Automatic annotation (TrEMBL), chain A:
GO terms for cellular component: nucleolus; preribosome. Its main location: nucleus. One of its GO terms (biological process) is rRNA processing. It comes from Chaetomium thermophilum (strain DSM 1495 / CBS 144.50 / IMI 039719) (Thermochaetoides thermophila). Component of the pre-66S ribosomal particle. The keyword Nucleus applies. This is Ribosome biogenesis protein NSA2 homolog. Residues 15-35 have a biased composition (Basic and acidic residues).
Automatic annotation (TrEMBL), chain C:
One of its GO terms (cellular component) is preribosome, large subunit precursor. Transmembrane segments: none annotated. InterPro entries: DUF2423 (IPR019434). It comes from Chaetomium thermophilum (strain DSM 1495 / CBS 144.50 / IMI 039719). It holds the Pfam family YBL028C_N. Residues 1-20 are annotated as: Disordered. Residues 1-42 form the DUF2423 domain. This is DUF2423 domain-containing protein.
TrEMBL record, chain E:
Coiled coil: none annotated. This is Putative GTP binding protein. It is found in: Nucleus. It comes from Chaetomium thermophilum (strain DSM 1495 / CBS 144.50 / IMI 039719) (Thermochaetoides thermophila). The lineage of its organism: Eukaryota, Fungi, Dikarya, Ascomycota, Pezizomycotina. It comes from the Eukaryota. Residues 1-50 are annotated as: Disordered. Residues 6-39 have a biased composition (Basic residues).
UniProtKB/TrEMBL annotation, chain F:
InterPro entries: Ribosomal_uL6-like, Ribosomal_uL6-like_a/b-dom_sf, Ribosomal_uL6_a/b-dom, Ribosomal_uL6_CS2. It comes from the Eukaryota. This is 60S ribosomal protein l9-like protein. Residues 16-85, 97-180 form the Large ribosomal subunit protein uL6 alpha-beta domain. Signal peptide: none annotated. GO terms for cellular component: cytosolic large ribosomal subunit. The keyword Repeat does not apply. Pfam families: Ribosomal_L6.
Length: 222, 245, 62, 110, 54, 190, 70
RNA sequence: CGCGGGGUUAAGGUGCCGGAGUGGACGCUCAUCAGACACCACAAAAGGCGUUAGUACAUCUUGACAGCAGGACGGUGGCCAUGGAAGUCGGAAUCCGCUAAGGACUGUGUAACAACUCACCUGCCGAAUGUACUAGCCCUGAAAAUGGAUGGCGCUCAAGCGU
RNA sequence: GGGAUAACUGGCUUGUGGCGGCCAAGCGUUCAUAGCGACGUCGCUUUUUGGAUGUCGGCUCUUCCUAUCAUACCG
């Protein structure tokens, strides 16, 4: 077998003597097979089959109406690519937990179970907030900001946290709950303000539940 | 309720013609009645109708119509009370089956002579009577099945091999060559597709069509003709022989 | 490995039984029965030809 | 893993696992086309003739229709289409022969 | 499937009073929630064609 | 909708003897006798004209009239079997190992036995017992072809399927290995 | 005789499945044809008149609103 | 709500255990663990070629759907591209004649052809259909680990469901 | 120091992310626009050259489930 030997063998000998007939018969039996599958399967498999069949019906109806209308009748990618290419060209051209452990060595601990934002790498907090530990992984540095106009969504760095309506204590710490307005750098977006002027930092409302879904999503306020 | 055929939608441009097409046919026949003088009525009982296009191209001068017999007959006017011109009711009662109309401006005798001289070979339709015991040799099956001499005959295709096997030939495609029996020959006996006097069925007719064997004669039988001035129809030969209602 | 109760093995065993061990066991039992026979030959009511009575949880007591 | 390690509720773990598996699902969904391309290249690289460049080899070349395929069928036991049209063979074909107890590999080029 | 020869664990139809009570309370809560949403807030078909004397 | 009445008609030719005692349709013809019990369905049989049998349902459902249609077809097939009989021209193909087929009348039970050897070189001999009433012959007109002739369509078709199923390839590429015994022609004796 | 899609040739020419057969007469069916067509037409002018009146009322209301705004 | 005799009822029941109807009328449903009387989540504009009723539209002797016998052409191997691409590997346009109808074409197929087949159209037959939805009953719509539950037996023109 | 909850789940659990837009049958305050609204697609995560884990365990034995590693069977 050097090259496309099955079609060479079909050219030299042909197929089975029964292939066309039984292929037609299977194509005909397909409907009864589908009905039996719909009426007999059970346990996650009927669920997968039902979702697949519902989808397939959706595209089938879409195709039917598309052909009907055509027979009767006789920039977000660009913006994202520009921002990403600018970033690529620009590129081309101790922890609080161990600190608190050392303090303890030298229920008294409360650890915040909600995502937060710090900013500066190392900070020694005033004693009023010293014992509010925040874990390593739960912070998020950048947020997915969706711009209501121009219909573009871009990942932009988080500047700071301004107001968490759930708790002023969460606000002061930097807890990122649902609907929480933070300050976001929008230099990459390049929106032009009055006097033909550009803006760098703007309000964005975190609108998801980051504890439910780690990815942090905000809608920009313009 | 349930348990019904899955209707296969046709993802293709061409659609039903319908009521608009039928009223177009009324309009065409009714408007083409006045200009011409001799409205011939003819029959093509059991012949393939490819060569109607050629006879159209030949008698470019005339105008020919062929649809639903009922549709054309009533467009003419079956009842004499609702009739475009006298005698057209007679033409309608002539119109029964595989029947076409022929508006002409010229000599009926010349029309009759030309249509008598018209004669083409054709592949047989289903239901006819076979005149020959045509068969294929036990050796290699060729393009026409041995009608032309094998030395000047190209072999038939492995693409057509499955169709021949489906339609009944005990043929086998060995070493890329399609053969009834053995590649060298002999071994088997042979396959006679149809016999003398046998009523050809759809299977045998498809066999002759695949092997390019013609055993039918395309000819048009003029039932009659109606003159505009006289307003009467004169039947000739096929007119009286062919049953009509 | 195919199970001892596999259908294919059962069919092969039946074929072996009917085709191989059959005649051998037949001839064996033939000579055995022959030697058995060698060793073995080595009024109606008053005579007992008519079978009579010798010498109830099915029906309810009456 | 860190998010689940710091998870605090059953619904927390619910939505975290759902979100992660969604991320992998979307990643493969974007990977849809490379899988098709790599499947096709796998199929051909499987149905690719295997020659030995080092061993004794004889290549047959020229214009099409000269008779290269006929020569290779004559000299070795390899099936090469001998159909008489311009580019009959679209791929390299390989046969082998013995010559005083020695192996040679013959290659037919298109 | 081989359910015919080897039946599985049966699904009991003998409802427990605790389950019945929970369903009753939750359904009552559903009715109250529907009422609350309704209070919060934010075409005649015609004579049938097949009627003989339309 | 509970249809009040429905009927179907079956014409019989001039040379048969049909009898339905309770529901045992027994048809007698030149080649032999075919008997089938139809006790599993509710039908009323009558002779509606000189040579047409009317099978009817009264106060039945759509499933019942469907049963009427299918039993009509089965009775028609029995008529066709006793008038003309059925023939199945069977073909076998091989690539390098010629298949050997031998048909023998096992006198006890009076039945054909067909043995197949050298099917893709397996030393196993595939022996298939043949349906009662149908006859098998090795065709002499064509090569590597058998003929299965009989009266009962169900019997002859089931036997042909049994042959085509016993000659089945295992764990091999069907695209390359084309050996087997296949149905070629299905028709009437006459 | 033509050919059938399956290899079966012995199958007789079957009639269309028709349990509701011979219940109505065609000519009567045609009178019902005409009556149904006329009823549909009547529905059409009734609906058209009602919709036209409603549209005229809506236009009058809009004109009154414009006059009030002015 | 004292102790007794007799009578009649409520809730609930009248196949047996259980005292009382295998009571009557019209229909629906066959579940590879149906359902069983006063309740819902799984659940969704969810899949069902199960079954019945119904609604709105469309064709119909001017012959409706399905089927069988056929035709399925001409400019033309349409324009760009290229080993070669002719309706059918690729981008765009997608027109006209003949028409009864035939798309610069729905698939099969060729190295390209060829050829088959599709759309559509005529001949044969002859009477309802066929598209989408609403409503009932039924299947699935998710399940682990000792053997058990409409209370049990069991029930299928019910001993299930609606009045 | 006072107050409050004695405590958790029990037809709960699994395989398919979230945010925003487009589309969207239906329903809706009076009508697909007060508005709700599935499947898909688009933008972000996400792209042009290939270690996490604290107390525990360790062994054996019985039984059971399958959401099956192997044996058997086929598409």
């Amino acid at each position: 077998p050097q090259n496309e030997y099955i079609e060479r063998h079909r050219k030299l000998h042909g197929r089975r003597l029964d292939a066309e007939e039984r292929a037609r018969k299977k194509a005909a039996r397909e409907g009864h097979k589908n009905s039996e599958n719909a009426q007999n399967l059970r346990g996650l498999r009927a669920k997968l089959y039902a979702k697949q069949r519902h989808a397939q019906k959706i595209q089938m109806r879409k195709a039917i109406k598309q052909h009907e209308e055509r027979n009767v009748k006789g920039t977000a990618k660009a913006l994202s690519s520009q921002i990403k290419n600018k970033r690529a060209e620009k590129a081309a051209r101790i922890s609080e937990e161990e600190m608190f452990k050392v303090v303890k060595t030298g229920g008294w601990k409360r650890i915040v179970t909600k995502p937060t934002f710090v900013g500066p790498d190392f900070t020694r907090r005033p004693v009023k907030y010293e014992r509010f530990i925040r874990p390593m992984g739960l912070r998020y540095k950048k947020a997915n900001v969706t711009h209501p106009t121009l219909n573009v969504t871009v990942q932009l760095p988080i500047l700071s946290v301004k107001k968490n309506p759930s708790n002023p204590l969460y606000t002061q710490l930097g807890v990122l709950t649902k609907g929480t307005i933070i300050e976001v750098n929008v230099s990459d977006l390049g929106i032009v303000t009055a006097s033909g002027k550009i803006a760098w930092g703007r309000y964005a409302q975190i609108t998801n539940n980051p504890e439910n879904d780690g990815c942090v999503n905000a809608v920009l306020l313009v | 309720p349930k348990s019904k055929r899955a209707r296969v939608y046709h993802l293709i441009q061409v659609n039903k013609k319908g009521r608009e097409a039928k009223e177009r046919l009324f309009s065409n026949i009714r408007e083409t009645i006045p200009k011409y003088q001799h409205c011939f009525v003819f029959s093509v009982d059991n012949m393939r109708n490819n060569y109607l296009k050629d006879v159209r191209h030949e008698l470019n001068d005339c105008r020919i119509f062929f649809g639903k017999t009922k549709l054309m007959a009533r467009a003419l006017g079956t009842t004499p009370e609702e009739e475009q011109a006298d005698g057209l009711h007679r033409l309608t009662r002539y119109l029964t089956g595989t029947v076409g109309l022929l508006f002409t401006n010229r000599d009926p005798a010349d029309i009759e002579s030309y249509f008598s001289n018209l004669s083409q070979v054709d592949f047989a339709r289903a239901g006819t009577v076979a005149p020959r015991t045509v068969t294929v040799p036990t050796g290699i099956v060729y393009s026409t099945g041995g009608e032309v001499p094998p030395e000047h005959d190209v072999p038939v295709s492995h693409t057509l091999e499955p169709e021949l096997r489906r339609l009944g030939m005990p043929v086998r495609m060995i070493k890329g060559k399609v053969c009834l029996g053995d590649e060298k020959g002999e071994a088997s006996e042979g396959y006679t597709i149809c016999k003398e006097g046998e009523v050809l069925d759809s299977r045998q007719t498809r066999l002759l069509k695949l092997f390019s064997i013609c055993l039918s004669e395309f000819k048009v039988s003029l039932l009659g003709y109606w003159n505009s001035a006289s307003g009467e129809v004169t039947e000739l030969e096929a007119g009286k022989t062919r049953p009509k209602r | 490995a195919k199970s001892a109760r596999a259908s294919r093995i059962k069919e092969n065993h039946q074929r072996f039984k009917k085709n191989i061990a059959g005649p051998v066991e037949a001839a064996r039992l033939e000579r055995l029965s022959a030697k058995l026979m060698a060793i073995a030959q080595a009024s109606g009511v008053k005579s007992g030809k008519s079978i009579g009575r010798k010498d109830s949880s099915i029906v309810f007591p009456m | 893993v860190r998010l689940l390690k710091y998870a605090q509720s059953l619904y927390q773990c619910k939505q975290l696992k759902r979100a992660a598996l969604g991320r992998m699902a979307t990643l493969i969904k974007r990977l849809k086309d490379p899988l098709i391309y790599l499947d096709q290249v796998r199929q051909h690289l499987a149905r690719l003739p295997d020659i030995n460049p080092t061993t004794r080899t004889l290549l047959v070349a020229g214009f099409p229709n000269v008779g290269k395929s006929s020569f290779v069928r004559s000299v070795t036991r390899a099936d090469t289409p001998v159909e008489p049209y311009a580019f009959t063979t679209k791929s390299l074909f390989v046969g082998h022969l013995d010559y005083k107890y020695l192996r040679y590999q013959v290659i037919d080029t298109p | 499937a081989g359910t015919i020869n080897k039946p599985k664990k049966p699904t009991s139809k003998r409802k427990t009073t605790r389950l019945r009570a929970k369903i009753s309370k939750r359904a009552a809560e559903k009715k109250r929630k529907e009422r609350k949403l309704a209070r919060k807030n934010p075409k005649d078909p015609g004579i049938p064609n097949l009627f003989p004397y339309k | 909708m509970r249809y009040i009445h429905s009927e179907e008609t079956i014409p019989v030719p001039e040379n048969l003897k049909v009898s339905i005692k309770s529901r045992l349709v027994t048809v007698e013809g030149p080649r032999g006798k075919l008997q089938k019990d139809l006790s599993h369905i509710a039908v009323n049989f009558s002779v509606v004209k000189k040579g047409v049998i009317g099978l009817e349902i009264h106060h039945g459902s759509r499933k019942d009239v469907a049963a009427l249609r299918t039993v009509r077809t089965i009775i028609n097939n029995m008529i066709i079997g006793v008038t003309k009989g059925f023939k199945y021209k069977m073909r076998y193909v091989y690539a390098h190992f010629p298949i050997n087929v031998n048909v023998e009348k096992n006198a006890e039970t009076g039945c054909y036995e067909v043995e197949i050897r050298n099917f893709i070189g397996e030393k196993i001999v595939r022996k298939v017992v043949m349906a009662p009433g149908v006859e098998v012959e090795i065709s002499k007109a064509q090569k590597d072809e058998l003929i299965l002739s009989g009266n009962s369509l169900e019997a002859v078709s089931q036997s042909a399927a049994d042959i085509q199923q016993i000659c089945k390839v295992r764990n091999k590429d069907i695209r390359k290995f084309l050996d087997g015994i296949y149905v070629s022609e299905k028709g009437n004796i006459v | 005789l033509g050919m059938r899609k399956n290899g079966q040739v012995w199958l007789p020419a079957k009639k269309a499945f028709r349990p509701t057969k011979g219940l109505t007469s065609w000519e009567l069916r045609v009178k019902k044809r005409q009556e149904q067509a006329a009823m549909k037409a009547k529905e059409r002018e009734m609906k058209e008149e009602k919709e036209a009146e409603r549209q005229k009322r809506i236009q009058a209301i809009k004109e009154r609103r414009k006059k009030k705004e002015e």
